[PDB]
Write a protein that binds this DNA or RNA. Sequence first.
DNA 1: TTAAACGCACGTACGCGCTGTCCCCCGCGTTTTAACCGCCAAGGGGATTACTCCCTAGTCTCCAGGCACGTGTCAGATATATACATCGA
DNA 2: TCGATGTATATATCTGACACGTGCCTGGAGACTAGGGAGTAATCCCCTTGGCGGTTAAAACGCGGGGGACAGCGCGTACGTGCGTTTAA
Lengths: 81, 49, 44, 36, 78, 78, 96, 74
Amino acid sequence: VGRVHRLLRKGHYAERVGAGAPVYLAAVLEYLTAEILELAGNAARDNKKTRIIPRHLQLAIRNDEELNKLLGGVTIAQGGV
Amino acid sequence: ISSKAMGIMNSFVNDIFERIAGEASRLAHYNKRSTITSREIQTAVRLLL
Amino acid sequence: MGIMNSFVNDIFERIAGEASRLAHYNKRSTITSREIQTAVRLLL
Amino acid sequence: VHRLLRKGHYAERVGAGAPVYLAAVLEYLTAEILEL
Amino acid sequence: RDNIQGITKPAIRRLARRGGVKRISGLIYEETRGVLKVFLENVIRDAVTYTEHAKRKTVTAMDVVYALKRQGRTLYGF
Amino acid sequence: DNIQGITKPAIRRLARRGGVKRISGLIYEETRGVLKVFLENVIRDAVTYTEHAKRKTVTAMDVVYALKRQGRTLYGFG
Amino acid sequence: PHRYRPGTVALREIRRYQKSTELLIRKLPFQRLVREIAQDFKTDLRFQSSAVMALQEACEAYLVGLFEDTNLCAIHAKRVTIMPKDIQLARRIRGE
Amino acid sequence: LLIRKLPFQRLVREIAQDFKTDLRFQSSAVMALQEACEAYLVGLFEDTNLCAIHAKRVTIMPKDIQLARRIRGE
DNA sequence: TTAAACGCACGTACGCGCTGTCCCCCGCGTTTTAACCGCCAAGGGGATTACTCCCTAGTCTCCAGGCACGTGTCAGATATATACATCGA
DNA sequence: TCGATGTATATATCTGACACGTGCCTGGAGACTAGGGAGTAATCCCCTTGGCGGTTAAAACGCGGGGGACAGCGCGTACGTGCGTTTAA
C-alpha cells in the first residue's frame, strides 16, 4: 500500500493524494491479477503441466473476449499466434 | 510458476498502473481540482476498463 | 478560426507531453533545451 | 508556453530555453499548416 | 424502437454518392443503420460518464469532444 | 548487401504459420521491402532514445520505448 | 512408387508450425542484417543480445499478422493463391 | 448537414434515455455528434469501395462492409 | 562433419476469357406527409460569492520487512521402441 | 481399402532452474505543528422544454426495360512433391 502512495507522490500525477486512493488501486490490481492467474492455472492443468509458461498466458488471454479486448495491442514474447 | 511468467506479470502490472494513473490525472485536470480521491480512480477505472 | 486555435493547443500538449516523458525517463528535475530538441526529433 | 509548462507539473523545474524552443516549434508548425 | 427508421434511404444514397459509389445494392441500408447505432451508443456512453462525474445535469460540447478524443479522432471547431 | 540473408524458406515458414496454402512467386520480393522499412523505422527510434541517455550501448528498454511510441507494446522484457 | 497429392503437405506444415513456438528466422543471418542496418545511423554502435532478440520477436510477430490479414483480402477474390496486390490492398486499408 | 436535424436530435435523446433519466442537452452537442457520424460513414463507404473494386464488380454489397470492418479491427 | 539451403525436371491443377439469360438498379411522374419558420410561456438549473474548518504536507525517531547470496534437488528433457492413424494408387 | 508414412505414447535415465534460509539495512510507521484548499449556503437570471399556426420541400409508391451479375465450358502454363548436389553454420 505504501509503494503505490510513494509512486503516486513521486510521479507528478497530482500535487496531492488522498488517503483512500491506494486501497482502491491496490484492490483493483489484486482483482485483475487473481483473474489472470486463475485462468493460466486452469490451462496448465488442462495441459497436464505443473508450471505456468508464457504460452499458457497467451492461450488464456486470447480465449477471453474481455481480456482480449483490454489487451488487443499487447504482444507476448515467445507467445506466438 | 516459471521465472518468465512472473517477468511478464511485472510488465502487465506496470502497464495497467500507468493507464489508471493517467486517466485519473486527466480527470483531475479537467475538473480543476488539486487532489486525487477515490472518485477520480473510480471514474478512471470505469472509463479505461 | 476555432480550428486553428485548437490545433495550436493540441500540438502544444503533444510536444510538452513528449518533453515530460523525456524528463521522467532520466529522473531529471529540470526540463532543458535538449529535452525539447529530442522531443521534436522523436515526433517529426 | 512557459506558464503552461510550469502549471502542467511536467517537472519541478523548467529551463529558460525549453519554453522558447517549444514556442518556436509551435509557431513554425502553425505557419507550415496554415500555408498548406 | 422505430425512431431508427428516421435515417431515410435518400440520405444514405447521398452519402454513398459522395463516397464515389457508382451502384448501390439494396441491402446496404440496414448495415449502415447498425454501424451508426453502435457508434452513437459508444460516444454517448462516454459523454454521459463525464457528465455524471462532474455532477452536472446538462450535457455540454466538452463531454463530446473528450469522448471523440478518447475514441481516437480529433474534432476541430468545438 | 546482406538483405539476401532473408532466404526463401524462412519467408515460406512465416507465411505457413499464417495459414497460407498457396504462395505466388512474387511474394518473396514483395516481403523484403516491408521488413526493411519496418526495421529502419524501429531502429531509428531506439537509437534516438539510447542517444538521449548519452550511452554507447543500446539497451532493450530503449527498443521497448521505440515500439511503445508506435503502439507496439511488447511484454516479456520487463 | 508412392506419392502424396498436391496440397496435402501444405496442411501438415500449417498444423505443425502453428503448434510450435520457436523462432523461425535464422539467428546469425538476422543478427548480421541488424548489424548492417544500424551502420546507417551511427558509427561504433553496440547492441546487446537481448536488443536483437527483441527486434527479432517484433518482426516475426508483425509479419505473421500481416500475412493473416493479406490472406482474407486474397480469398475475397475467390482465389487461393496470394499475390502482391493483396498485400498492397491490406496495407492501404490499414493506412500504413 | 445532410441528415435531417430533427430526426437525428430525437435519435440522440433516445440513446441518452438508456443511461440517465431527465437528461438535458446543449444545442451544440447534438450537431457535434451529427458531424462525427457523417464523417465516419463517409470514410467507411470510401474504404468499402476499394473492396468492391477488388472483385472487379460495380455493385457494393454487405460483404465489402464486413470485410473492411474485420480488417480495420472494429 | 552433418544438416541446412539450392537446384532440377515432371505434371496436375489453377487461373483466366468466352458465352447466354433473366432479374432488379435506375429514371420520370403524381401525390402527400411533416420539416421548418416564427412567435408565446415559464421554471429548472448554471455561474458567482462568502464562511470557516478539518484534512494533508513537512520534520523527526526506530524498527522489522525485503534485497543480495548461497544451497541442493526433482520437473522437465532427449532418446528409444513401437503403436496406430491417415492418406493414396 | 489396406498398407506405406508419419506422428504419438510409455519407459528408464538425466541435470540444472527453482524453492528456501540467512544476514542486514533503508525505507515505512507513529507523533507533532501548521494552514489553505474545499464543503456548505445564497442569490441572480438564462436558456431550455413545451405549444401553436401554416406552407411547400422532400419523401413516398408505380412501372417500365435493359445493365449487369452469374453458372458454365475450355485450355495453357505456374507452382507443388521428391531426388540429388553442396554450402557455411
